[PDB]
Curated annotation (Swiss-Prot):
Species for this entry: Centruroides sculpturatus (Arizona bark scorpion)
Listed GO biological process terms: defense response
Protein name: Toxin CsEv1
Disulfide bonds: C12-C65, C16-C41, C25-C46, C29-C48
Free-text domain note: Has the structural arrangement of an alpha-helix connected to antiparallel beta-sheets by disulfide bonds (CS-alpha/beta).
Entry keywords, A to Z: Amidation, Disulfide bond, Ion channel impairing toxin, Neurotoxin, Secreted, Signal, Toxin, Voltage-gated sodium channel impairing toxin
A GO MF label: toxin activity
GO cellular component, one term: extracellular region
Predominant location: secreted
Length: 65
């Protein structure tokens, strides 16, 4: 399942700047709290692939940025 990371702060989707590969998104996603293996920035967001549904991923069932 794929999804766009999200700032746990308020819920607004997680944005980024340097496009292409990254060490910050590739890390948080590889964290054992998600299970995703691949991941990068799509224009200005953080796309990931390899995480169950239990992981809170935009949109948010309790938030609406």
């Amino acid at each position: 399942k794929e999804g766009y990371l999200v700032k746990k702060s308020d819920g607004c989707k997680y944005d980024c700047f340097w496009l292409g590969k990254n060490e910050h998104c590739n890390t948080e996603c590889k964290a054992k709290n998600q299970g995703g293996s691949y991941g990068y920035c799509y224009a200005f967001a953080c796309w990931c692939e390899g995480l169950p549904e239990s992981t809170p991923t935009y949109p948010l069932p309790n938030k609406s940025c």
